[PDB]
Write an enzyme that holds these catalytic residues in place. Structure first.
Site, short mmCIF file in Angstrom:
data_model
loop_
_atom_site.label_atom_id
_atom_site.label_comp_id
_atom_site.label_asym_id
_atom_site.label_seq_id
_atom_site.Cartn_x
_atom_site.Cartn_y
_atom_site.Cartn_z
N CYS A 20 31.12 35.64 -21.59
CA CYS A 20 31.08 36.54 -22.73
C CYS A 20 29.77 37.30 -22.71
CB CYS A 20 31.22 35.75 -24.02
SG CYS A 20 29.91 34.60 -24.26
N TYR A 91 22.99 11.40 -5.67
CA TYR A 91 23.53 11.22 -7.00
C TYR A 91 22.57 10.39 -7.85
CZ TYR A 91 27.95 13.11 -5.31
OH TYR A 91 28.88 13.96 -4.75
N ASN A 100 18.79 8.67 -17.03
CA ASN A 100 19.52 7.44 -16.79
C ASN A 100 19.64 7.12 -15.31
OD1 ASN A 100 21.40 5.36 -16.46
ND2 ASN A 100 22.45 5.93 -18.37
N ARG A 105 26.90 7.21 -10.72
CA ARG A 105 28.30 7.61 -10.60
C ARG A 105 28.70 8.65 -11.64
NH1 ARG A 105 33.12 3.24 -9.93
NH2 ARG A 105 34.69 4.64 -8.98
N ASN A 114 30.70 20.63 -13.23
CA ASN A 114 29.94 21.87 -13.23
C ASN A 114 30.87 23.08 -13.28
OD1 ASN A 114 28.24 24.03 -12.81
ND2 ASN A 114 27.90 23.58 -10.64
N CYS A 122 25.45 22.02 -7.21
CA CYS A 122 25.98 20.67 -7.27
C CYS A 122 26.36 20.30 -5.84
CB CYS A 122 27.19 20.60 -8.22
SG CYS A 122 28.44 21.87 -8.00
N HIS A 123 26.11 21.23 -4.92
CA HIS A 123 26.40 20.98 -3.51
C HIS A 123 25.19 20.30 -2.88
CE1 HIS A 123 24.38 24.88 -3.78
NE2 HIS A 123 24.06 24.81 -2.50
N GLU A 144 22.18 26.66 3.98
CA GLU A 144 20.86 26.24 3.56
C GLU A 144 20.23 25.38 4.66
OE1 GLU A 144 20.40 24.90 -0.51
OE2 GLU A 144 21.97 26.26 -1.18
ZN LIG Z 1 30.95 32.89 -24.87
#
Ligand SMILES: [Zn+2]
Length: 149
Positions: A20, A91, A100, A105, A114, A122-123, A144
């Site tokens: 948006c 991870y 934490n 996991r 994500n 997240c790769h 990369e």
């Molecule tokens: Zn929005």
DNA sequence: GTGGATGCGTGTAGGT
DNA sequence: CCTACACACATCCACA
């Protein structure tokens, strides 16, 4: 949230950018707003200028997970801010890093969750065993500079 | 709601 | 290296 879309061609294929005016809602791989232009620019940089990437402005995120504090949000945030280009983290490392340590996991879930991949690396999150649409994760990592195996 | 089921993890342990 | 297993844990999902 008067939704806006736009699709960008990338080495990975066609990325459909939707959000948006209060921010990007999601980056999705198929095969007029500012946060959309910022994101388009950013993505292009990432593909053809990973040096000056830290220069391009990160788009504002407006997806519901980014509308209120959630372990998942803490993670995605930490991940984006800490683990930069070419780097990687496990991870559990991210888990602890997020606060934490025993949520290794859960972090995996956060990754599945994500809404803006590539933007939020997240790769770059792998197994503490070094182990790694799997093709794409590997393609991003290769892009990369990572080895195989 | 609550409560059990779920999975993008990880360290321990034995087997080939 | 690999299947087996026990565990820790934020979410999700189905049922109440
Ligand atoms: Zn929005």
């Amino acid at each position: 949230c008067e939704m806006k879309r736009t699709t960008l061609d990338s080495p990975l294929g066609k990325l459909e950018l939707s959000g948006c005016e209060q921010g990007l809602h999601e980056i999705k791989l198929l095969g007029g707003p500012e946060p959309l232009m910022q994101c388009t620019a950013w993505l292009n940089a990432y593909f053809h200028q990973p040096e000056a990437i830290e220069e391009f402005p990160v788009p504002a995120l407006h997806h519901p997970v980014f509308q209120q504090e959630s372990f998942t949000r803490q993670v995605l945030w930490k991940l984006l801010k800490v683990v930069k280009f070419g780097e990687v983290i496990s991870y559990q490392q991210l888990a602890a890093l997020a606060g934490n340590p025993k949520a290794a996991r859960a972090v995996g879930g956060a990754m599945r969750g994500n809404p803006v991949p590539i933007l939020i690396p997240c790769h770059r999150v792998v197994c503490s065993s070094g182990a790694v649409g799997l093709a794409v994760k590997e393609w991003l990592l290769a892009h990369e500079g990572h080895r195989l195996g």
